[model samples]
Target: KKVFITTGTEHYLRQLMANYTGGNVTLLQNFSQSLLYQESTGGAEYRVLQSSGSIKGFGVVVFEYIHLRDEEIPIFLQMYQRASLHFSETPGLQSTKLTKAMNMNKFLIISFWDSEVFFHDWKKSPLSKEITNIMRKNNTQSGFSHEDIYHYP
Candidate 1:
């Protein structure tokens, strides 16, 4: 299995999905791609906040879409970065990507894990509990899959 992520305009994303031949393409709500408001937008902005472990053929991909208040964007960004550091130390956690939605206060957190067992083990830990609590305080939607694309360039 593999995992991949991409952002684009709704129309553009639909086009991608229509012709996409790799694996499943999960379209995130409020997610999009852009360059600049001034310049014509096309490319996407991305970075890996934290990463560890080696990629394996089979694992689980977790996605969390965080819908925050306008004022909470900065707060979550800082918290996410800090949490990502701890996540990097987690067993079975391969990587964590923190992303911001274009023109919105939403953010997406993608985590790759060795398997459902490891993912569940981590989720039951104190850190995951805290993270879950934070999500409960906000409008957070999360999902996971055992098969998909990890990254797309």
Candidate 2:
């Protein structure tokens, strides 16, 4: 089902533009306030760069913020880069992607999991404290969520 955005108190639809760019048309954004495509890809086909190793499980954790305090941007960028590098080899972290928007001081972090168990545990550890704090202090939502990967044949 398509998630529609009304003047909704949806945590997902923070920004809704109606009939803008096109008449009587609406664009969707998610709770993290990214494009609907970013939320869940639409109208696309894709393939993967696979390897012969064990492809076990997967998970994703994302943080999105808007109206963030300006001062935190530089710090976030630095820590984000460090987090990606540090965690990538720290075990259980497959990958990470961090996107920033200057106009609203917004940032989105998408982290992939190699071991969902370890990743979940790490979220409570100092592994992500700095970035977590910045988001909590500057954004509307502090509590975050994670997901398990689903495979289809």
Candidate 3:
């Protein structure tokens, strides 16, 4: 199974997301990416879902796309990078910023493949290498952190 998970700080972000993108952009992007993976590559049918919560002045929004193909892991990573850049670069969308302190929240975009073989291969791909290096440098310089997991279902 393949799973894509995106977690991020929320605040009034939820209200913005709900109103700004018609509450469908997230789902649309997920389904579109899933279609690309399944039709253009080798992946299975998938689903996209989202959830959010707020505590005090902190909040979080998570989006998960599950059931991915092993061979398409590289594609998935590329899609993720594209999506991230798209959001970060889009006008009006980048208005909100997450500072390191001030009880700010963190964001994550993670993918889980069916096997370590696929994950390793994807991580080692040339495209993956370049993007990973860039992201690694950014994270190191920006103090960003992430975690990975492997589970059977």
Candidate 4:
């Protein structure tokens, strides 16, 4: 969990990963790196299943990939919603979005925070431990990544 603001391009994103797969070359041309994922709806953004709060100013963006067997999705979502309610009370939390992949049994949880400090605080909280316990019982595979969010005119 590191946050550093840089002024120039470092390297370009060229390949897909287990968690990400598609992107718009045109929009991507403005940046050097990206988290791209493909959707069955021809590059449309993932459909949002749940959302809360509002995105504001320059902030920290956190995303977690939750992968599970197809049959376990509904069960996982119930747990996800309950955990989300708890997280919503965290300080500096700006917004959260839960999305589902169109063609896979994968869910992405995106969170916006006023600062990385607040995000880390939540990570160490008992709420976080509780969610981890549920994920373990669900036998899911998950990954987390965070980045500084910048807005350009």
Candidate 5:
């Protein structure tokens, strides 16, 4: 399964290492090395892209997920990609560049996934266990929020 992990700069380094090398390791990168990392980490089977930015005063991070299997959804949500949208009227989000917060400058988690079933399975995986640990231990100072939207094209 292919999954993207997003977090603030304060936790960016830690998040990258945890997701890319910890378990079921896949790919990793920051904005500065996005292109290079994408080519290296993202093989023909899967792809991952990473970036850093700021929204208001909050640090923002984004990861793009691609070529993932249906069974990977549960783990996808469990790791990150909390907000899943099928269709969006958010014109501001139509760009490849990272998004910035409008009001509080708070960072947000926005992700795209392939199917609902995949999302469900990932949530039930042992990977979720490790995610829970990280959330409980390191996600205090940072506010974490998510939304899911399923759409058909």
Candidate 6:
């Protein structure tokens, strides 16, 4: 239910395989890739968290895609690169993946951590804005659905 609520089919199968490799892992779809299936509705910023004492390899896996840019450039790169600095070095950050859509003005990002506490610690900071506000422009936002999924940590 959460997978349907949150984040795919091959995207699903691939991600499932990617999730279990443990320690640290990531999969990059074609930088010049194309998918026949219409992409899902997603692209919002929010935290979907659970409070538990068991760390459970618990962490965050955020996927980001930017469908905006002009004159051939990853327009969102500068902001995201800078924003990533806030958490990349933070404690419990196991891995973070940033994949740019091929031939498209967007990106996909996934971050893993040791616990929700650590993920939230950095998220609460103002620097977090740089990462969360990826799709807004002049206070306007395109329609995009956001979700949180769960699996054994």
Which model scores highest in TM-score? 4
For every model shown, what is its TM-score relative to the native structure? 0.55, 0.48, 0.29, 0.58, 0.25, 0.48
Reference-based lDDT, each prediction = 0.53, 0.40, 0.31, 0.54, 0.32, 0.41
Clashing pairs in model 4?
A: 22-37, 22-38
For model 3, the run of ten residues with the poorest summed lDDT: 34-43
Candidate maximizing lDDT: 4
Off by over 4 Å in 3: 1-107, 139-141
Q: Report residue 6 deviation for candidate 6 (angstroms).
A: 12
In terms of lDDT, the poorest run of 10 residues in model 6 is 34-43
lDDT of 2 by residue, 18-125 (tens): 223322122333343333222211221211111112223234433333234667556655655555545635566554444443234444444445545766677686
Higher TM-score: candidate 1 or 6? 1
Clashes of each: 7, 1, 3, 2, 11, 2
lDDT of 5 by residue, 1-153 (tens): 222333234244455555444322223334433211111231122222232221221122233212223354356544443322312332223212222233232232333234345444545555335434444444333454333232321
lDDT of candidate 6 at residue 12, scale 0 to 100: 58
For residues 14-76, what per-residue lDDT tens digits would candidate 1 score against the true structure?
666665543323443332341111111233333333334444435666666556676776776
TM-score of 4: 0.58
Clashing pairs in 1: 2-148, 2-149, 3-148, 3-149, 3-150, 4-149, 4-150
Global CA lDDT of candidate 3, please?
0.31
lDDT, candidate 3, at 65: 19
lDDT comparing candidate 6 with the true structure: 0.41
Model 3 Cα RMSD, 1 decimal: 17.0
If ranked by lDDT, best first, what sequence of candidates would result?
4, 1, 6, 2, 5, 3
Q: Score candidate 1 by lDDT.
A: 0.53
Model 6, runs deviating above 4 Å: 1-58, 71-75, 82-88, 138-150
**TM-score head-to-head 2 vs 4, winner:** 4
Can you give the lDDT of residue 21 in candidate 2?
36
Badly placed stretches (over 4 Å) of model 1 are 1-54, 139-153
